[PDB]
């Protein structure tokens, strides 16, 4: 047994899980605090946070299997993150002109 | 011990190996068409064999004409190459270091494919009389004078070596002198006295003998080689070599020969440590005997030991400042710490090496005995002199009392290798030293051993092959903690620590600290922030948070603190995970019962 | 001039038949004598023609005479053997009629060995002398040599086979009965050496075939103070009296003749190790071995003039005083000046001087701590004239111990040498040394059997340096020199072999050599990426630090930002501030130390890795702020609990 | 015996190289899982010291899976230091541990945007 | 084909990502919650997050495709730490005086 490629598989999915957690903690803590901006901020976020959350962990279970069948998982990862960093900007530049705005 | 075949399986760096002689094939071939024919050998079968064997021939020998003329190329090509470097030196660039170094590294692969190729050629010429000899002992037909004919006709072997070995120390030599202004690994080895000679002979297939005589002669006293070590009355120096520490002085007084040498070698072994690693920079010089005494005892200036060298002027004086200032710092060190002779470690050396040629170097150290020359127990065994007369090399030392003298049971193998990156140590120096001769024994001394033994009653830190003795090493042809240090002598190891440690030290505690913090960031919201009832959860998050960090420095400076001075440190954590657990769910409940009392009660 | 002890040595019943060496001189000498004022072709196609004819008499008389005698006796000693059979004759054997028959044997067979001894010396001489005198004229080594090859017994220094012979009937005799024992004439860890000459084409192949079996010795120069040429040049300075005692005693077998020479290596301007050597083979009746005793001293150029022309024991005094200062044990001290005294002594007695220098290279190949076989080749063999005879013009000054001439500056002294000072040996010598310490055979040496009897060597039995050296530079002087080796005719030859002859015409002596000894034998029974990772490790805590860094800036702005809203204002921008700088020096300190450590990873010099200081630093100021912050938040500025005050009520 | 093993074929105990780079990956995971628990944590009692009584309720959810973790965590720290210390390995445990606690994590989410929608 | 370097790319590129959501969660936070003065620390903060997560996302790529392509060498990574020490620095003591100052 060689579970080297699966250790740095599971640090790779602790790391995304330390982003979501962060994240979604942050949009909690927006959502019971804030006024109807910062709800709606709030729900954005944790969209954000949880759908990171489960893309994380369908990857994760999905290249530990591919290690087990081959030894290497899926590397599309040119979009996941690109779409998290994309979703990220939206939300905070949304939060900021409903800001402006009211 | 080994048939031919794998002999040359073993000698070969798989550059040589599709070319040397089907040794086992021919062998095949002769056993099985005996065997065919009821024991009986024809014409046919003759042919048959004279034509397996010429084709064998050819192949030989066009290898190693090939491999001759590539070696002509090579030489001519850098003696050209060496007379222009040497030409540019007048001009206004001149070559400099590294194309001088370049050079040699280029003439040491000219030297090791020389040999190569010599080993090669003479392996061959062996093989092809092996089967010759086979052949018309096995069959009732001659077969010498043919083939002999056929290979003086094709003379592969015939081919003068040592020339080329000579032209290309010459051109090393001619190049270090004109330039000055790998992976090594030295390992020690425990042979048993019935292993030795078989040991010995393996090494004799593939290495030459050193032979410090003119006439080439193996006297007695000529691989003679003691070495007076010296010492305080507290033997800090053997503390300081024991517990590798930084500048670790080791000063001996040592020579060849018997004792009708004038010549004594004072050298000193400095132990040098970065995070890169650990080295050791060895500097000697020689100093006639007559004076040794004197220098001693300062009675015999710097100036006055490097005068003739100065007034002959056949040294740069970039070396002579350096000797003298070995000089002045040896026998400042002897005059400031008061150090005395303390062991004699004599031994017969016999080195292998073949000339010019650095890739494997041998050295087989016998009859090592150590004798106890200081007076730590009031008995002047040295009449103020550097050294005992009452004994010289005159093995095994009936004269001494039983108490002085330490006759090591086993031999001891220096194995030293200088791998060029690319390559692998040779197969044969590989199955030597993982044989059932030899019992590796890293990071023996025979200054420490000397110490630990003669002096053990005057120490208290021993190394860990003293109390491992009484061990049989013999092993048959092809787990131990329980080596407790003896009452009173705590055995020292030191332990080095890999560089990138040094920072995983680190990592964690931040890894602990900014966890801290984030309890910190609760502790003080519910104190600054927090109403009445809040302070009383923060209670708990504030003991969490200082016992968190309270841990993480201790734990990290006990760390950096172990990892200086070479000490064995525990990295595992069986406080801290489980601490933080229990204390982090308890103050979630002390908080939680605080909010929940004040809701009922 | 050889020719007086040719006369001395005249035994009379055989007076006729010695060569007539004075008159082939003087046919020699007739072209100088004879037309002394008229020196236009003094040697005619006639003189050579009348000399030839007057060597080939004489060559026809002498070994005509030896070969005669030798079959003589050989007829006796079949007569003598017809009585090694048919044991009830061997039990009627007459030992007193034996005893005489051999007495007079091994007589006949002495006398014999010294008629062909000075006959051959004067044969040679005289050949020499002619190919001398009369280069343009065709050389009469030919006839000579032709001569010598038709002989039923090859002359090459070993005893001749009537001495083998009578010793094995005299061991017969005394197997019988050895009752009245015998004459005293009767002749019988052992070692054995054999010596070759190995042509220049065969050495390359010759060390293969030893060095399958034995390692190559390689000269390594011992530390010396410049310790803080590939292989050397041995030169040999071999001493000799006017008489030249000590050559005639070791070529005519004289047990206990010794050799004195002084041996180093380099060049004397080096001023390396000298070594005053006598060295004795020693070989007794009752003795079965060749026992050998070498006696060394360690000399010093200074004290060499003194000691062996002066006769001065002050080089004795001085070593002996610098060796016991040295702390020299007592028993070698004793050793050492017994050995000086029976140096000085034989040197003062037989009046030893040094006579020539012999350089050469040697090649060894022995198993260390193995004495058992040991391989010596010697190449580049070169002798140098160094004899202060010629009283007129001396080679070398009397009172110097060697030449001046060869031993300069000049970086080609050899040109120094005239004709007839030099001399170089063609072939390589090999001597095999067997240490048979055991009584029984030879113990699978088969390889030294198969070099022996190969085509690759040529053996020559008691060969020797110190004699080739003396035959080839003072053999041609009749005052110096009146005996001569028996191999000198051999060098002149192509010792080289057919290889495929070796088993045709080689195998002819090899087989003939070989049915000899089994039917000896037969007989006998009737009777890097470390920096890298460091680097990168370096780059992740820089990045580790700057989270810290962040972390500490996020709590410091929330509390800055939120400090009116706090229940104590005061202490939250006292913690404000407090966060503020460690968050200002954690930022300063993590670049610091990640460019301190990035120039020890590059500079890769420095002990340790680590920095402490920071770490130790920001974690007690985060103890001693919060620390601070609960004692504010539960003393004078928030009095609620001065020790243990709060309990569950609100 | 300061670490002085004996290699399997040789009869002199010589000292043993430990290799950190095994407890320190224990470490690590431990350290990560432990972040997860702090802020979960902090959250939890931040919305219960603070919060209104939507918030009071909803700071269970968070803590609760907080305690989860944090157990889930020393369990499987200690266990893989267990295993370590004799002979390492241990790799299929951490599959349904994450994903359990990620479904949690994920419930207490929505119950969370629940109250806090409806209410 | 080697999954430990991709996982390592991500790793680090989550690495950053925890930069960037401390700071544009300093700086949500304080455009929810905070006065005039502090909305403008919020604007600086989260544009220094905003900056942190677009060099991580450029990062992310251009060495996910030099692992594709070549394989390995990170000795090129040392001006991003940097520049984020500096704007750390220099972005704390302008919002700290800006607070002061009003
Ligand atoms: C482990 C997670 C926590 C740490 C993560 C961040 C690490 C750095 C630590 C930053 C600490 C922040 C200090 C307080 C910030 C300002 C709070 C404030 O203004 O309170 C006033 C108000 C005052 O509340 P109040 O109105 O009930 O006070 C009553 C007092 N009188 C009557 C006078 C008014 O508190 C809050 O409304 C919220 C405070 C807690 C915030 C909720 C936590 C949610 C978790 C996510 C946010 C993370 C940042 C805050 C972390 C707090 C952890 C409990
Ligand atoms: C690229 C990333 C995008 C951003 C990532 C997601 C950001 C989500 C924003 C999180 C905001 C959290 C707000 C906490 C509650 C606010 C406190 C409050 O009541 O206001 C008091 C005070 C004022 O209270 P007030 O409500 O009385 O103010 C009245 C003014 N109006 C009417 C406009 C509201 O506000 C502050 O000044 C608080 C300072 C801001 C606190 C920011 C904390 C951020 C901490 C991040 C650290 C993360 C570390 C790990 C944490 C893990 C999760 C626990
Ligand atoms: O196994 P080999 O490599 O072929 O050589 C061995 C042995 O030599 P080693 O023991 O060193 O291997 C002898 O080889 P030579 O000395 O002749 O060169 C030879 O024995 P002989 O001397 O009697 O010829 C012969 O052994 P044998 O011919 O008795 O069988 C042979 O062993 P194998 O023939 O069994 O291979
Ligand atoms: O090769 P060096 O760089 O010169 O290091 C030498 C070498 O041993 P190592 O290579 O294994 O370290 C010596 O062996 P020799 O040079 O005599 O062949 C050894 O001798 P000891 O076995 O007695 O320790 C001792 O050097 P020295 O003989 O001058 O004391 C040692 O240095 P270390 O103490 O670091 O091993
Ligand atoms: O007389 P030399 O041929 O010139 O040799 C002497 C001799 O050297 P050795 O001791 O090795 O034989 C001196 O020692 P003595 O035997 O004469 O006592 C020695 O003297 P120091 O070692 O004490 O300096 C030294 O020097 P010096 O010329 O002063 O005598 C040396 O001289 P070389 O350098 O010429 O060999």
């Given at each position: 047994?060689?579970?080297?490629?699966?250790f740095?598989?599971?640090?790779?999915?602790?790391?995304?899980?330390?982003?979501?957690?962060?994240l979604?903690?942050?949009?909690?803590?927006?959502?019971?605090?804030?006024?109807?901006?910062?709800?709606?901020?709030?729900?954005?976020?944790?969209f954000?946070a949880?759908?990171?959350?489960?893309?994380?962990?369908?990857?994760?279970?999905?290249?530990?299997?591919?290690?087990?069948?081959?030894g290497?998982?899926?590397?599309?990862?040119?979009?996941?993150?690109?779409?998290?960093?994309?979703?990220?900007?939206v939300?905070?530049?949304?939060?900021?002109?409903?800001?402006?705005?009211? | 011990?080994?048939k031919?075949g794998?002999?040359?399986?073993?000698?070969?760096?798989?550059?040589?190996?599709?070319?040397?002689?089907?040794?086992?094939?021919?062998?095949?071939?002769?056993?099985?068409?005996?065997?065919?024919?009821?024991?009986?050998?024809?014409?046919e079968?003759?042919?048959?064999?004279?034509?397996?064997?010429?084709?064998?021939?050819?192949?030989?020998?066009?290898?190693?004409?090939?491999?001759?003329?590539?070696?002509?190329?090579?030489?001519?090509?850098?003696?050209?190459?060496?007379?222009?470097?040497?030409?540019?030196?007048?001009?206004?660039?001149?070559?400099?270091?590294?194309?001088?170094?370049i050079?040699?590294?280029?003439?040491?692969?000219?030297?090791?494919?020389?040999?190569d190729?010599?080993?090669?050629?003479?392996?061959?010429?062996?093989?092809?009389?092996?089967?010759?000899?086979?052949?018309?002992?096995?069959?009732?037909f001659?077969?010498?004078?043919?083939?002999?004919?056929?290979?003086?006709?094709?003379?592969?072997?015939?081919?003068?070596?040592?020339?080329?070995?000579?032209?290309i120390?010459?051109?090393?030599?001619?190049?270090?002198?004109?330039?000055?202004?790998?992976?090594?690994?030295?390992?020690?080895?425990?042979?048993?006295?019935?292993?030795?000679?078989?040991?010995?002979?393996?090494?004799?297939?593939?290495?030459?003998?050193?032979?410090?005589?003119?006439?080439?002669?193996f006297?007695?006293?000529?691989?003679?080689?003691?070495?007076?070590?010296?010492?305080?009355?507290?033997?800090?120096l053997?503390?300081?070599?024991?517990?590798?520490?930084?500048?670790?002085?080791?000063?001996?007084?040592?020579?060849?020969?018997?004792?009708?040498?004038?010549?004594?070698?004072?050298?000193?072994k400095?132990?040098?440590?970065?995070?890169?690693?650990?080295?050791?920079?060895?500097?000697?010089?020689?100093?006639?005997?007559?004076?040794?005494?004197?220098?001693?005892?300062?009675?015999?200036?710097?100036?006055?030991?490097?005068?003739?060298?100065?007034?002959?002027?056949?040294?740069?004086?970039?070396?002579?400042?350096?000797?003298?200032?070995?000089?002045?710092?040896?026998?400042?060190?002897?005059?400031?710490?008061?150090?005395?002779?303390?062991?004699?470690s004599?031994?017969?050396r016999?080195?292998?090496?073949?000339?010019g040629?650095?890739?494997?170097?041998?050295?087989?150290?016998?009859?090592?005995?150590?004798?106890r020359?200081?007076?730590?127990?009031?008995?002047?065994?040295?009449?103020?002199?550097?050294?005992?007369?009452?004994?010289?090399?005159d093995?095994?030392?009936?004269?001494?009392?039983?108490?002085?003298?330490?006759?090591?049971?086993?031999?001891?193998?220096?194995?030293?290798?200088?791998?060029?990156?690319?390559?692998?140590?040779?197969?044969?120096?590989?199955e030597?030293?993982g044989?059932?001769?030899?019992?590796?024994?890293?990071?023996?001394?025979?200054?420490?051993?000397?110490?630990?033994?003669?002096?053990?009653?005057?120490?208290?830190?021993?190394?860990?092959?003293?109390?491992?003795?009484?061990?049989?090493?013999?092993?048959?042809?092809?787990?131990?903690?329980?080596?407790?240090?003896p009452?009173?002598?705590?055995?020292?190891?030191?332990?080095?620590?890999?560089?990138?440690?040094?920072?995983?030290?680190?990592?964690?505690?931040?890894?602990?600290?900014?966890?801290?913090?984030?309890?910190?960031?609760?502790?003080?919201?519910?104190?600054?922030?927090?109403?009445?009832?809040?302070?009383?959860?923060?209670?708990?998050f504030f003991?969490?948070?200082?016992?968190?960090?309270?841990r993480?420095?201790?734990?990290?400076?006990?760390?950096?603190?172990?990892?200086?001075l070479?000490?064995?440190?525990?990295?595992?954590?069986?406080?801290?995970?489980?601490?933080?657990?229990?204390?982090?769910?308890?103050?979630?409940?002390?908080?939680?019962?605080c909010?929940?009392?004040?809701?009922?009660? | 001039?050889?020719?007086?002890?040719l006369?001395?040595?005249?035994?009379?019943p055989?007076?006729?038949?010695?060569?007539?060496?004075?008159?082939?001189?003087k046919?020699?000498?007739?072209?100088?004598?004879?037309?002394?004022?008229?020196?236009?072709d003094?040697?005619?196609?006639?003189?050579?023609?009348?000399?030839?004819?007057?060597?080939?008499?004489?060559?026809?008389?002498?070994?005509?005479?030896?070969?005669?005698?030798?079959?003589?006796?050989?007829?006796?000693?079949?007569?003598?053997?017809?009585?090694?059979?048919?044991?009830?004759?061997?039990?009627?054997?007459?030992?007193?009629?034996?005893?005489?028959?051999?007495?007079?044997?091994?007589?006949?067979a002495?006398?014999?060995?010294?008629?062909?001894?000075?006959?051959?010396?004067?044969?040679?001489?005289?050949?020499?002398?002619?190919?001398?005198?009369?280069?343009?004229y065709p050389?009469?080594?030919?006839?000579?040599?032709?001569?010598?090859?038709?002989?039923?017994?090859?002359?090459?220094?070993?005893?001749?086979?009537?001495?083998?012979?009578?010793?094995?009937?005299?061991?017969?005799?005394?197997?019988?009965?050895?009752?009245?024992?015998?004459?005293?004439?009767?002749?019988?860890?052992?070692?054995?050496?054999?010596?070759?000459?190995?042509?220049?084409?065969?050495?390359?192949?010759?060390?293969?075939?030893?060095?399958?079996?034995?390692?190559?010795?390689?000269?390594?120069?011992v530390?010396?103070?410049?310790?803080?040429?590939?292989?050397?040049?041995?030169?040999?300075?071999?001493?000799?009296?006017?008489?030249?005692?000590?050559?005639?005693?070791?070529?005519?077998?004289?047990?206990?003749?010794?050799?004195?020479?002084?041996?180093?290596?380099?060049?004397?301007?080096?001023?390396?190790?000298?070594?005053?050597?006598?060295?004795?083979?020693?070989?007794?009746?009752?003795?079965?071995?060749?026992?050998?005793?070498?006696?060394?001293?360690?000399?010093?150029?200074?004290?060499?003039?003194?000691?062996?022309?002066?006769?001065?024991?002050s080089?004795?005094?001085?070593?002996?005083?610098?060796?016991?200062?040295?702390?020299?044990?007592?028993?070698?001290?004793?050793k050492?000046?017994?050995?000086?005294?029976?140096?000085?002594?034989?040197?003062?007695?037989?009046?030893?001087?040094?006579?020539?220098?012999?350089?050469?290279?040697?090649?060894?190949?022995q198993?260390?701590?193995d004495?058992?076989?040991?391989?010596?080749?010697?190449?580049?063999?070169?002798?140098?004239?160094?004899?202060?005879?010629?009283?007129?013009?001396?080679?070398?000054?009397?009172?110097?111990?060697?030449?001046?001439?060869?031993?300069?500056?000049?970086?080609?002294?050899?040109?120094?040498?005239?004709?007839?000072?030099?001399?170089?040996?063609?072939?390589?010598?090999?001597?095999?040394?067997?240490?048979?310490?055991?009584?029984?055979?030879?113990?699978?040496?088969?390889?030294?059997?198969?070099?022996?009897?190969?085509?690759?060597?040529?053996?020559?039995?008691?060969?020797?340096?110190?004699?080739q050296?003396?035959?080839?530079?003072?053999?041609?002087?009749?005052?110096?020199?009146?005996?001569?080796?028996?191999?000198?005719?051999?060098?002149?030859?192509?010792?080289?072999?057919?290889?495929?002859?070796?088993?045709?015409?080689?195998?002819?002596?090899?087989?003939?050599?070989?049915?000899?000894?089994?039917?000896?034998?037969?007989?006998?029974?009737?009777?890097?990426?470390?920096?890298?990772?460091?680097?990168?490790?370096?780059?992740?805590?820089?990045?580790?630090?700057?989270?810290?860094?962040?972390?500490?800036?996020?709590?410091?702005?929330?509390?800055?930002?939120?400090?009116?809203?706090?229940?104590?204002?005061?202490?939250?921008?006292?913690?404000?501030?407090?966060?503020?700088?460690?968050?200002?020096?954690?930022?300063?300190?993590?670049?610091?130390?990640?460019?301190?450590?990035?120039?020890?990873?590059?500079?890769?010099?420095?002990?340790?890795?680590?920095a402490?200081?920071?770490?130790?630093?920001?974690?007690?100021?985060?103890?001693?702020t919060?620390?601070?912050?609960?004692?504010?938040?539960?003393?004078?500025?928030?009095?609620?609990?001065?020790?243990?005050?709060?309990?569950?009520?609100?």
């Amino acid at each position: 047994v060689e579970p080297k490629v699966f250790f740095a598989n599971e640090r790779t999915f602790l790391s995304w899980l330390n982003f979501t957690v962060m994240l979604g903690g942050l949009g909690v803590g927006l959502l019971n605090f804030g006024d109807k901006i910062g709800r709606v901020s709030a729900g954005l976020f944790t969209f954000v946070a949880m759908g990171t959350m489960i893309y994380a962990l369908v990857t994760y279970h999905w290249r530990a299997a591919a290690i087990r069948r081959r030894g290497s998982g899926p590397y599309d990862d040119r979009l996941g993150p690109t779409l998290l960093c994309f979703f990220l900007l939206v939300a905070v530049i949304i939060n900021f002109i409903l800001r402006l705005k009211y | 011990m080994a048939k031919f075949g794998e002999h040359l399986s073993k000698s070969l760096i798989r550059q040589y190996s599709y070319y040397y002689i089907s040794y086992d094939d021919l062998k095949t071939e002769l056993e099985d068409n005996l065997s065919k024919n009821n024991g009986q050998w024809t014409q046919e079968l003759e042919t048959d064999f004279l034509e397996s064997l010429e084709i064998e021939l050819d192949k030989v020998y066009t290898f190693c004409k090939v491999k001759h003329s590539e070696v002509f190329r090579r030489v001519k090509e850098v003696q050209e190459q060496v007379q222009h470097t040497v030409r540019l030196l007048d001009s206004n660039n001149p070559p400099t270091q590294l194309d001088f170094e370049i050079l040699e590294e280029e003439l040491s692969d000219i030297i090791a494919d020389v040999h190569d190729l010599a080993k090669f050629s003479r392996l061959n010429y062996t093989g092809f009389q092996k089967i010759i000899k086979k052949h018309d002992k096995k069959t009732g037909f001659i077969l010498k004078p043919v083939f002999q004919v056929r290979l003086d006709s094709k003379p592969f072997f015939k081919e003068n070596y040592d020339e080329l070995v000579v032209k290309i120390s010459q051109l090393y030599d001619i190049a270090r002198t004109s330039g000055r202004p790998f992976v090594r690994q030295t390992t020690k080895y425990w042979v048993h006295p019935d292993n030795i000679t078989e040991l010995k002979l393996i090494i004799l297939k593939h290495l030459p003998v050193l032979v410090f005589n003119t006439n080439k002669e193996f006297e007695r006293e000529d691989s003679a080689i003691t070495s007076i070590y010296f010492d305080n009355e507290n033997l800090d120096l053997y503390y300081g070599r024991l517990r590798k520490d930084e500048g670790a002085e080791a000063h001996a007084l040592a020579w060849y020969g018997g004792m009708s040498t004038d010549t004594i070698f004072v050298e000193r072994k400095t132990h040098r440590e970065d995070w890169t690693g650990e080295k050791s920079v060895k500097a000697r010089f020689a100093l006639k005997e007559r004076h040794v005494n004197d220098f001693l005892k300062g009675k015999y200036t710097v100036d006055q030991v490097f005068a003739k060298m100065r007034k002959e002027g056949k040294k740069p004086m970039n070396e002579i400042e350096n000797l003298e200032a070995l000089a002045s710092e040896i026998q400042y060190v002897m005059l400031k710490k008061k150090l005395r002779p303390v062991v004699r470690s004599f031994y017969n050396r016999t080195a292998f090496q073949l000339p010019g040629d650095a890739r494997v170097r041998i050295s087989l150290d016998t009859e090592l005995t150590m004798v106890r020359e200081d007076n730590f127990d009031g008995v002047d065994r040295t009449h103020k002199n550097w050294r005992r007369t009452d004994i010289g090399v005159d093995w095994p030392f009936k004269q001494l009392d039983d108490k002085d003298i330490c006759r090591f049971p086993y031999a001891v193998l220096n194995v030293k290798l200088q791998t060029q990156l690319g390559q692998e140590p040779p197969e044969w120096v590989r199955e030597l030293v993982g044989s059932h001769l030899v019992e590796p024994v890293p990071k023996f001394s025979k200054f420490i051993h000397g110490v630990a033994t003669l002096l053990n009653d005057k120490v208290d830190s021993i190394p860990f092959w003293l109390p491992q003795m009484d061990v049989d090493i013999r092993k048959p042809p092809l787990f131990d903690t329980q080596i407790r240090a003896p009452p009173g002598k705590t055995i020292c190891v030191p332990v080095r620590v890999e560089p990138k440690v040094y920072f995983a030290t680190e990592r964690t505690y931040l890894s602990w600290l900014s966890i801290s913090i984030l309890l910190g960031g609760v502790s003080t919201t519910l104190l600054t922030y927090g109403s009445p009832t809040a302070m009383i959860g923060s209670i708990g998050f504030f003991i969490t948070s200082l016992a968190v960090l309270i841990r993480t420095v201790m734990v990290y400076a006990k760390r950096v603190v172990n990892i200086r001075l070479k000490r064995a440190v525990d990295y595992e954590d069986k406080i801290g995970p489980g601490m933080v657990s229990v204390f982090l769910i308890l103050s979630i409940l002390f908080s939680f019962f605080c909010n929940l009392v004040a809701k009922l009660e | 001039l050889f020719g007086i002890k040719l006369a001395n040595d005249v035994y009379p019943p055989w007076k006729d038949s010695y060569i007539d060496y004075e008159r082939l001189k003087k046919l020699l000498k007739e072209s100088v004598i004879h037309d002394g004022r008229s020196s236009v072709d003094s040697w005619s196609e006639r003189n050579e023609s009348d000399f030839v004819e007057a060597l080939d008499k004489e060559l026809e008389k002498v070994y005509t005479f030896q070969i005669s005698k030798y079959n003589a006796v050989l007829r006796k000693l079949d007569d003598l053997e017809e009585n090694t059979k048919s044991a009830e004759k061997i039990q009627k054997i007459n030992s007193e009629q034996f005893k005489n028959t051999l007495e007079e044997c091994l007589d006949e067979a002495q006398r014999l060995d010294n008629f062909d001894r000075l006959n051959f010396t004067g044969f040679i001489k005289i050949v020499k002398k002619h190919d001398k005198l009369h280069p343009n004229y065709p050389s009469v080594k030919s006839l000579l040599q032709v001569r010598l090859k038709e002989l039923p017994f090859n002359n090459s220094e070993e005893y001749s086979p009537l001495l083998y012979r009578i010793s094995y009937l005299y061991e017969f005799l005394r197997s019988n009965y050895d009752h009245p024992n015998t004459v005293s004439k009767s002749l019988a860890a052992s070692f054995k050496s054999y010596k070759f000459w190995v042509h220049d084409d065969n050495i390359m192949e010759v060390k293969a075939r030893i060095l399958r079996h034995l390692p190559a010795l390689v000269y390594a120069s011992v530390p010396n103070e410049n310790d803080d040429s590939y292989d050397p040049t041995i030169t040999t300075l071999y001493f000799d009296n006017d008489f030249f005692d000590l050559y005639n005693n070791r070529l005519l077998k004289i047990s206990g003749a010794p050799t004195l020479r002084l041996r180093w290596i380099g060049k004397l301007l080096d001023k390396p190790d000298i070594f005053l050597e006598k060295r004795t083979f020693t070989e007794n009746t009752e003795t079965g071995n060749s026992s050998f005793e070498e006696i060394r001293l360690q000399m010093k150029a200074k004290f060499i003039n003194n000691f062996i022309f002066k006769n001065d024991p002050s080089y004795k005094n001085y070593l002996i005083n610098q060796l016991r200062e040295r702390g020299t044990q007592k028993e070698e001290l004793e050793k050492l000046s017994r050995d000086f005294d029976n140096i000085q002594n034989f040197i003062v007695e037989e009046k030893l001087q040094p006579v020539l220098r012999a350089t050469y290279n040697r090649t060894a190949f022995q198993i260390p701590g193995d004495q058992s076989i040991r391989v010596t080749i010697d190449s580049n063999i070169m002798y140098i004239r160094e004899d202060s005879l010629d009283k007129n013009r001396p080679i070398r000054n009397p009172e110097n111990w060697h030449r001046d001439d060869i031993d300069s500056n000049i970086p080609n002294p050899l040109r120094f040498l005239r004709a007839g000072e030099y001399s170089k040996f063609p072939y390589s010598v090999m001597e095999i040394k067997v240490i048979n310490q055991d009584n029984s055979q030879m113990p699978n040496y088969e390889w030294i059997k198969d070099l022996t009897n190969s085509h690759l060597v040529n053996e020559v039995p008691k060969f020797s340096l110190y004699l080739q050296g003396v035959a080839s530079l003072f053999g041609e002087d009749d005052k110096y020199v009146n005996i001569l080796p028996f191999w000198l005719p051999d060098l002149e030859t192509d010792i080289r072999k057919n290889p495929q002859e070796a088993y045709e015409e080689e195998k002819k002596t090899l087989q003939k050599q070989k049915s000899i000894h089994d039917k000896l034998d037969n007989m006998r029974r009737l009777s890097v990426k470390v920096e890298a990772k460091v680097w990168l490790a370096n780059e992740r805590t820089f990045n580790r630090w700057l989270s810290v860094t962040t972390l500490l800036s996020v709590l410091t702005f929330s509390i800055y930002n939120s400090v009116q809203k706090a229940e104590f204002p005061q202490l939250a921008d006292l913690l404000a501030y407090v966060y503020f700088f460690l968050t200002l020096f954690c930022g300063v300190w993590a670049y610091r130390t990640y460019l301190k450590r990035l120039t020890l990873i590059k500079g890769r010099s420095g002990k340790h890795l680590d920095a402490p200081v920071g770490p130790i630093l920001v974690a007690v100021v985060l103890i001693v702020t919060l620390v601070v912050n609960f004692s504010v938040a539960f003393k004078e500025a928030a009095r609620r609990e001065r020790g243990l005050v709060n309990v569950s009520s609100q």
